[PDB]
Amino acid sequence: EASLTGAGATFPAPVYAKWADTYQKETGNKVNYQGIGSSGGVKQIIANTVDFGASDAPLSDEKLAQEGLFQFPTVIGGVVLAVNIPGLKSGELVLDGKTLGDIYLGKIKKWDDEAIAKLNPGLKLPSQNIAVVRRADGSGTSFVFTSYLAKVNEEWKNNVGTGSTVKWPIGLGGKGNDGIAAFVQRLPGAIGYVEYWYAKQNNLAYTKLISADGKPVSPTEENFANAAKGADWSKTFAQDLTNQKGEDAWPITSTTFILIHKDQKKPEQGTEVLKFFDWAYKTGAKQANDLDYASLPDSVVEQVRAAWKTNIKDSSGKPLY
């Protein structure tokens, strides 16, 4: 039995934690996962403080090469807007990209703003102030969210841009996906972006969103999967899954990554990290789906396995998979 340590993205922390627990029950191996945000995860893996780091934001092939790291995707999740609006049921409210961006820009101050009312004809909206919540910590979810906003709101794109950390025009800072979930729960009128699980498991109402094709879609495991249908995984694991074309394609979808060293100084640890994720690929789909994360296609797991064989080695050049 091995004691493994991973750290980073809170976006997939629920599934990593479920997997870790099941893995220990079946094999005794212990995987400790620390949800510190993707930025912290990349920092920790580079400093060799953990066996694997985790980030929703992919590192470029050049950055990976400069750092001697290898990155592989695990699951597909979705970012949703958790809200606390008086009188509204979860999934009742519909927002499109431009209006969502105007909300994050601080231009739309009330829930019954004309722009929101037009996207929701017949929906009774309260004159409640919108309490914008965003991430305090360096975040892969912020990267995905701002990548999306830049595509649908020019003002956002030009003034704030995209990143794991950005100069938020407005909004209170929550620490981690759970921090934003907690804020939304205690703040009437709040809106905050979180990985789907954080909304669902905290019984937070969330909104529908207009797809890239122009249609209202609900955030569901299948709709996150739909957003990745046009992904040419063959080309790279670093797939952009925001605002993708297609029927029922959730617009703020994303995969997430695990970062490990190619040259394993502690080869038993590396070997065990690969076995945990391999077991997850072959055995953990039901657990991932149960937590509303879509599974990576089998072809993609085969690519990961093939890449592990050629990229992960000990100091003597011997493959750890």
Curated annotation (Swiss-Prot):
Subcellular location: Periplasm
Binding site for phosphate: 9-11, 38, 56, 139-141
Keyword Signal attached: yes
Record-linked Gene3D superfamilies: Periplasmic binding protein-like II (3.40.190.10)
Keywords: Periplasm, Phosphate transport, Signal, Stress response, Transport
InterPro entries from the UniProt entry: ABC_phos-bd_PstS (IPR005673), PBP_domain (IPR024370), Phosphate-bind_PstS (IPR050962)
UniProt record, GO biological process: DNA damage response; phosphate ion transmembrane transport; phosphate ion transport; response to radiation
Domain of life per record: Bacteria
Gene Ontology cellular-component annotations: ATP-binding cassette (ABC) transporter complex, substrate-binding subunit-containing; membrane; outer membrane-bounded periplasmic space
Induction cue: By phosphate deprivation. Positively regulated by PhoB and negatively regulated by PhoR.
GO molecular function per UniProt: phosphate ion binding
CDD domains named among the record's database cross-references: PBP2_phosphate_binding
Disulphide-bridged cysteine pairs: none
Similarity annotation: Belongs to the PstS family.
Subunit organization: The complex is composed of two ATP-binding proteins (PstB), two transmembrane proteins (PstC and PstA) and a solute-binding protein (PstS).
Task performed by this protein: Part of the ABC transporter complex PstSACB involved in phosphate import.
Protein name: Phosphate-binding protein PstS
Source organism of the structure: Escherichia coli (strain K12)
Gene: pstS
